[PDB]
Design a binder for this molecule. Structure first.
Ligand SMILES: Nc1ncnc2c1ncn2[C@@H]1O[C@H](COP(=O)(O)OP(=O)(O)O)[C@@H](O)[C@H]1O
Ligand SMILES: Nc1ncnc2c1ncn2[C@@H]1O[C@H](COP(=O)(O)OP(=O)(O)O)[C@@H](O)[C@H]1O
Ligand SMILES: Nc1ncnc2c1ncn2[C@@H]1O[C@H](COP(=O)(O)OP(=O)(O)O)[C@@H](O)[C@H]1O
Ligand SMILES: [Mg+2]
Ligand SMILES: [Mg+2]
Lengths: 456, 73, 57, 456, 456
């Protein structure tokens, strides 16, 4: 049946329905004669429901007829979503026609049960040396990405999108939570030019959209990722900024009139984060792994938003402006970046000792560099100068030419295995390559390629 | 000396009024061509008594739950 | 002997000023935590006062 | 028609009138029997108006009949107001009987239009070294004396009144808003004993008066100044504290049914301030030169009230508690004070370079102060040791004995001309006085008196 | 007559009675089917009263009958209470049978009048060096032990119970307000095994209890003590934690319909404290020496509850988490702690000068902390270095092993007389001990033990 608009206050709209036809919480409603969607938030009673417009409310009036759809916001899922740009409701924002969908799924569901969890920890082989050695990702895990602009964040996402599809038969989904319209257009062309667009589904909630759109885009992208996982795949879910998901929840909570919590956040802060993060896991069919960019308010790591997010992160990848100047384009900081999987009871004693060996040598070199600067290179012992030489070789061997970066590097891309990554660094730590020049260990991929690059 | 007492167990109304009662006793000398001196041992306790009455009367609070007219007090 | 003691004075001072720089950073680190605690507390108090006044008016 | 009091709560009173005889916004009402005036602030509905008492409510009761006057508060204006003391309602508060008015104006009015504004840069000399150097005032300009409690706002204003109003050929309006009754008595006897009371109109609303009185006293004084400006005359307008106008609005805002904003202020803080401040201006008919004292709550210049006030003024003079705590008066901060006249095109290149030269030395001394505290003064360069000595001399050469402050210091007052100020600071910056001790520059006047003081 | 439960919200219950039979404020009511006791707080109108339950409300429902008892909560008083444990309602909770009471008293009374007050300046030696030096206690006076969580409040009270029962021959009353149930069991068996129990009355309302019990237990203990004071006896009234009486009031305040004050506290905070604190006094009939532990929320001494308590005490002992972190016990702050007895006319000049000298030394040492923190002790002046050395010795000489702490440490307890306390600190101030190492003063009781500790 149908109801009538009774009150309009900004993005908040109240609708009255017959006592026998009141729509459910989270049900999607359609205004007759206008392209406006309302998501139901609360049942006030006496037939009246409180909803949030998923669009602009300009030109709406009291008394307009509204229709119930019988289910939550339902979006297209499957193969047809690849290489397409969509809004929060699943509409094709690109001027490429209708999506060739075969099925539609509602955006709200429970996380997989206690019985649906996978039987252990399985690393996701990214094929990138520095990440697979120092920042090992677990399948079904959540990775926090930290750093400023112009440090390789976009190129690193495109390489991961290429490798999951070509080396693991998977797919990717990108959720633009509070996306800037200029950057959203630039990213779409960069992926078309890099030939990765047909391997990813793009869902954008732009900054100029109402709070309800920015809050639900993460669930729309997650619903598309859930479909591929059920197919029998390992999937990558990229979230453009997890802080903007928290802020959209704060904005919606204030519009609905709820009493604010500590530091002004919504009272539901931990539950809203848990509802999103608990769906990203390794099941008994497939595994959704997520890469999420993280923003820290006022540089305070104790602030409720950073605090809550860090509770669901399995790894932290930090991109460094200093490392980029050195010339290592991946730009991941081996000392600041960390992973909960860097444990001998998970990755075995060999991988753990090799990774901790690289971190120890790189720590000592950072201390020695201040000594060499303040007092001079002649002041160091013979053992310390030998360490400096191995540290420099390790530092350059952390570099790698990516297939999406051939335009910048002028060289073909490389996919190094975890086995080849461990063997190369273990050899340099033991001194098996002490005769080779450090440059021979720059932009080569596996350790056998350094040997030849040195031969010429 | 005249000693005016509104101790900690007394009604918040008596603690709120005590400075004005003492002021009135001092003004008797001023208005008759004489000199007087008055000590208010705690105006911050008079403000706390006034805040209690005002909140129980359901008047809207200000800067630290204090009444809007705490300056005029 | 005098000249060698002057070389010792310079080296000793190098160490004293390195220690002082490190100690300063530790104090800066401790103060920044107290500052963040004060920043968060100021926000909660103001919101309570806004909500409290709006719940009367 | 006639109305009945229906609700008294503090200074706010509700009056109910026939639904065909509801008085206008800002309309004045009179209580029957009791001598009390109420101004309509809001029309609640059903013939009821919300008003604020311009007197005490201890004698008011529910059911008292109230009369509609058909207009807003009308105060006497013109020549009859000179040499008289008046309240908010324009009644005489001096024993000299009634005022022979020939016209009454309404305190509420529109601000002059955009086409009526006038621009002028005539330099006005004050006789104070710090102001004449970094805050040069202009005829027809707006000046603000910003400062906390006990730093010199009243004293400095009195010195200006003496160095300008006494010589000023035109008329003058002095408005005491939320002032101490003792200051008003001292100033009245001072204007009367100085024979200058004949050219000064005095309006007083002290701290012992009801919120409504302190909320409209500024509009009464300004209405008298506007009558004189509109006659084509040049007028001086002095306001003792314009903060008391904002505070009276905060004290009454919550009882008027308005939700509070940040730092417990009325939600109408910026509009209530703009409506008053835009009338205090120099149009194309006559010129109002105005000096306002601005109280800074808890010495915090970021507080919403002080922060909203800076944009309304041409000259901003800042008084510092840290300078006053060192026994240095006037306690003007030469790094926070500013003027639109501090421009090479208006004041000349020599004055401008001397002012910027003094500010550069003081900013450099502010950053060397901590070094000197921890390590000591011998660990500075030869250039820094010399700069610290000159900064301490400049900081003491800005102090000045005032004629209105002789009761507080015991020392005779001094008037320094702009030529003498520039010469004294240019000399200290150049090095012409690097032999005299810093104590020779403390509380003296022109640079010759520092030379004489040094010998003794 | 009989009323009906009309509303239930947590610990607060509304009951409706016939208009001619409405119970008075503080009247006790009993629920017919469960015998649960309720205390009337306010009369709401229409025959409805609001009350707090003196037990659990689980299982209660609307419509149950309620009986008015015609009087306030009445508890047994006199000799029959000695060596017995009671709850908030005066029921025995020690399994030893009924109390042989001759009379009962209501728990609400007015404080004694101004003309029934008594002045006590007789010093009460505690045996603790820090307290006997800077916080001298007096017979018939009030003491407050202020401190954060786990800093020493209960340990310092148990030591004061042990060393004050040496000279005192009368009765004691102990009120356990919202503290650990294990600590009440430990104290009861300790006194029972030591044969001290027949001179102590015990009342409990611990952390396990509902809000109504924790709110009224303090009144029940004080009422029994008042019976002994008014029989012309010297009594000791010990309160396990006075802050819990105020906190139980905060949990119930919003349910009583009251608007909150600063940081969520009840608007009635200072009156509730005074109404209980004023009754705890030495009248002319008898004396009540009282020692109260005062909890400090999140270590903030500026919090409204601790801030409001200081004015009700004769001696203030302020414990500190920093002093406790260095190893010192008792962790008293000599610079924050104070007493009304620290006067030359009460204790003599010699003790007063020793205390003034100790404080002067520590105050200067506190001021040099930041300089030593960055540059170390070696840059201080010759005199400064000497003070820093005496300040460090005075600090460890304020440490003392307690007889209630030999179980925690294993070292034996020490009792130090006032004469030995003055002699030890006077010697350290004069420089008579400048040749002993600092660690010879830590936990040494008397100064002679420091001389014998320095031999190792
Ligand atoms: N892997 C790479 N190989 C070579 N150059 C790179 C690489 N990654 C980043 N860069 C350089 O850094 C620039 C910015 O990288 P990008 O991924 O777009 O960072 P961001 O998205 O923050 O702007 C690139 O245009 C390129 O010049
Ligand atoms: N120029 C000055 N010379 C000497 N003392 C001054 C001067 N200005 C202020 N003071 C001191 O402070 C008082 C003036 O403060 P006042 O002008 O009333 O401050 P405000 O108006 O900012 O509260 C004087 O009583 C005196 O003690
Ligand atoms: N030697 C000590 N002397 C005093 N207090 C100590 C000592 N060592 C540790 N503390 C701790 O102080 C606690 C008691 O004080 P506190 O926690 O403040 O009292 P409360 O139980 O009332 O909260 C003890 O249980 C003990 O663990
Ligand atoms: Mg003043
Ligand atoms: Mg305890």
């Amino acid at each position: 049946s149908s109801g009538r608009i009774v009150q309009i206050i900004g993005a908040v709209i109240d609708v009255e329905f017959p006592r026998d036809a009141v729509p459910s919480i989270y049900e999607a409603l359609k205004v007759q004669g206008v392209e406006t969607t309302l998501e139901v938030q609360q049942q006030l009673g006496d037939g009246v429901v409180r909803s949030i417009a998923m669009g602009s409310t300009e030109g709406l009036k009291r008394g307009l007829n509204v229709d119930s759809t019988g289910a939550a916001i339902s979006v297209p899922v499957g193969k047809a979503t690849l290489g397409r740009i969509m809004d929060v409701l699943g509409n094709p924002i690109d001027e490429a026609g209708p999506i060739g969908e075969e099925e539609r799924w509602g955006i709200h569901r429970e996380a997989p049960s206690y019985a649906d969890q996978a039987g252990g920890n399985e690393l996701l082989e990214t094929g990138i040396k520095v990440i697979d050695l120092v920042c090992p990702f677990a399948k079904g895990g959540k990775v926090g990405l930290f750093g400023g602009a112009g440090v390789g964040k976009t190129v690193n996402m495109m390489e991961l999108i290429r490798n999951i599809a070509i080396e693991h038969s998977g797919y990717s989904v990108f959720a633009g939570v509070g996306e800037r319209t200029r950057e959203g257009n630039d990213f779409y062309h960069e992926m078309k030019d890099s030939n990765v667009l047909d391997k990813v589904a793009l869902v954008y909630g732009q900054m100029n959209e109402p709070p309800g759109n920015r809050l639900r885009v993460a669930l729309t992208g997650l619903t598309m990722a859930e479909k591929f996982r059920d197919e029998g795949r390992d999937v990558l879910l990229f979230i453009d900024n997890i802080y903007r998901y928290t802020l959209a929840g704060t904005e919606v909570s204030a519009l609905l009139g709820r009493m604010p919590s500590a530091v002004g956040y919504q009272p539901t802060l931990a539950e809203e984060m848990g509802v999103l993060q608990e769906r990203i896991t390794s099941t008994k069919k497939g595994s959704i792994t997520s890469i999420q960019a993280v923003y820290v308010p006022a540089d305070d790591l104790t602030d409720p938003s950073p605090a809550t997010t860090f509770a669901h992160l399995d790894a932290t990848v930090v991109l460094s402006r200093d490392i980029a100047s050195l010339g290592i384009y991946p730009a991941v900081d081996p000392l600041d970046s960390t992973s909960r999987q860097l444990d001998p009871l998970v990755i075995g004693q060999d991988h753990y000792d090799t990774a901790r060996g690289v971190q120890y040598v790189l720590q000592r070199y950072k201390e020695l560099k201040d000594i060499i600067a303040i007092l001079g290179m002649d002041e160091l012992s013979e053992a310390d100068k030998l360490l400096v030489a191995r540290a420099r070789k390790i530092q350059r061997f952390l570099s790698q030419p990516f297939f999406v970066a051939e335009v910048f590097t002028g060289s073909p891309g490389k996919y190094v295995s975890l086995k080849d990554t461990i063997a190369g660094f273990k050899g340099i730590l033991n001194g098996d390559y002490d005769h080779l020049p450090e440059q021979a260990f720059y932009m080569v991929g596996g350790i056998e390629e350094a040997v030849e690059k040195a031969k010429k | 000396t005249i000693v005016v007492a509104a101790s900690a167990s007394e009604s918040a109304a008596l603690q709120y009024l005590a400075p004005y009662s003492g002021c009135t006793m001092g003004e008797y000398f001023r208005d008759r061509g004489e000199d007087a001196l008055i000590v208010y041992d705690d105006l911050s306790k008079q403000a706390v008594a006034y805040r209690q009455i005002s909140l129980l009367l359901r008047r809207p609070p200000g800067r630290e739950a204090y009444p809007g007219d705490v300056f005029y007090l | 002997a005098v000249v060698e003691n002057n070389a010792c004075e310079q080296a000793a001072r190098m160490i004293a000023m390195k220690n002082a720089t490190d100690n300063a950073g530790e104090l800066i680190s401790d103060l920044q935590l107290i500052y963040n605690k004060a920043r968060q507390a100021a926000i909660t108090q103001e919101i309570s006062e806004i909500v409290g006044g709006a719940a009367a008016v």
